[PDB]
Design a protein around this nucleic acid. Structure first.
Ligand SMILES: [Cl-]
Ligand SMILES: [Cl-]
Lengths: 293, 293
DNA sequence: TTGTCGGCGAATCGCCGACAA
DNA sequence: TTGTCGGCGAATCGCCGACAA
């Protein structure tokens, strides 16, 4: 289910539609793969590459549960939801799970309060179609919504620890969906060979106008690097200036406008906005909005 | 400890020494990275690349325990040991671990048989220096060597299942070492971008005579692709012929001698020997020996 | 509102010879 | 030689209100 995939990725995540023109930004692709590790031949590669979004394949690791997507590019010429950060008691083998009162009313199905105690056995599917059975009971003094039977098994099988978060989604159907967003945490190739591979594949696809492929790792990608081409153009046509107040979907002030990496990426709009927050320091024009909406 | 690293990799594994000339075989490097997944721009890349072995870095995944090495190449112009495949009872929460009688005598320290029952608390370090305490008891009827206290914890923490194997090494020192060899089982880059990255990095290093780097995954590499250059030359000078009997460090018969992939790797000695076993079908001259020693 | 706790009953865990392959 | 089993004692597991933040 695609709604579950975006929930585990992040609330502000929504990939461009297949068949639409997108702006491929290689600086951001490298930033993603460089976050997995810690010079190279210089390629004549443009800082932006308009591409047709040929295909998207949402995927999830079975054992680890991390979500990722495979995108195919070709260079050119809603539902009720809630998330809770798991506490120590939630993950402890001692007790069960404390359901936020707002979540049980706005997300979980309504219990029969005429029962004593009100209870139901919920059944939720994860990203791989596996069913999970939870007993949802309303007890305690003061009274509360708890998940008892089936919760600790869910904790051990998915190896959940405190600080992690559990997700629940209820669509129009009675079926429930459950997800996991783990707290922040080179096996096949070294980083320079990964770095070189990204450039050469993009270069070959750019000069030949042939389609290539990449992996999107949402929870390991600081800034999206496949954005709608229209959103990219409207950002370029925008004329930011020093001292302007901006906002992010947190507020700050633009302190400068210059290139982020003028050595190998001259004239690039990537992270070209020097900013200072009010309470990371280099952002792109398309991820900010003038701070007076 | 380097002895533990090679134990977890495999008995027939021993990398060339640092500072020696090695034969880099890109066909085998691709075979390794293609085993992690399931067309590309053609590169003028030779089937063998003599390189100086600049550095080796043995490493091990902390959580998963898989071993890998980072090698740095530059193109040019002993101890008592035993291994047991873990049974169901070994991994079951029910009992402990059955130590093979030959292992306790030839590897583990000698128990004081004057005790009743003979026992000692062993302390072994894993690949990351963590200590593991096991009670080694000699009991049962018929009598046997068992590991009781500390074994089931070792099973749960390392997530061991039946079919996996445990290793133990005893050097000249009293300190013991323990290892794990798990049964046979794309996150950051797609396979074509991995494929392209291997070629381009090797190509750039070959034409510029600059040093590059790669990852060796022993338990995911079917045939070694960084071998001593002398061993490669002596294989080329060898004149195999059809019908010759060969042996592998299993015996068979050579049925043909031709190129393995004449499309993109013409005139390559890689897997250039068609063989038929007596009881996989394409091997290289340097991994076989005439079957009459 | 909700995280943590103690309390017991339920249950898995773990060490021990008893047995065949 | 050694894998699996039953047997109990040891122990963690799990559901329940009681309590403050
Ligand atoms: Cl899916
Ligand atoms: Cl080491």
């Amino acid at each position: 289910d695609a709604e579950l995939w975006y929930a585990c990725a992040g609330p502000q995540k929504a990939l461009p539609p297949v068949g639409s023109v997108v702006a491929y930004l290689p600086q951001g692709h490298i930033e993603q793969v460089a976050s997995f590790n810690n010079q190279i031949p210089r390629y004549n590669l443009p800082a932006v590459i308009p591409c047709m979004l040929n295909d998207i394949q949402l995927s999830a690791d079975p054992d680890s549960d991390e979500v990722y997507a495979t995108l195919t590019l070709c260079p050119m010429s809603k539902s009720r939801s809630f998330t809770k950060t798991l506490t120590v008691s939630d993950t402890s083998t001692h007790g069960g799970f404390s359901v936020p009162r707002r979540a049980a009313d706005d997300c979980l199905p309504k219990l029969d309060m005429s029962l004593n105690p009100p209870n139901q056995e919920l059944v939720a599917k994860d990203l791989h179609g596996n069913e999970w059975r939870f007993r949802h009971i309303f007890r305690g003094q003061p009274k509360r919504h708890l998940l008892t039977t089936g919760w600790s098994v869910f904790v051990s099988q998915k190896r959940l620890v405190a600080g992690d978060a559990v997700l629940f989604l209820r669509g129009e159907n009675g079926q429930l969906r459950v997800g996991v967003r783990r707290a922040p945490r080179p096996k096949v190739l070294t980083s320079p060979t990964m770095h070189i591979g990204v450039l050469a594949a993009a270069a070959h696809a750019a000069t030949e106008k042939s389609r290539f492929s990449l992996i999107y790792n949402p929870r390991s990608c600081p800034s999206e690097f496949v954005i709608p081409y229209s959103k990219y153009l409207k950002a370029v046509k925008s004329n930011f200036n020093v001292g302007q107040r901006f906002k992010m979907k947190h507020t700050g002030t633009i302190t400068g406008i210059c290139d982020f990496d003028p050595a190998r990426w001259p004239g690039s709009e990537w992270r070209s906005l020097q900013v200072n927050w009010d309470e990371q320091e280099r952002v792109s024009p398309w991820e900010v909005e003038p701070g007076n909406s």
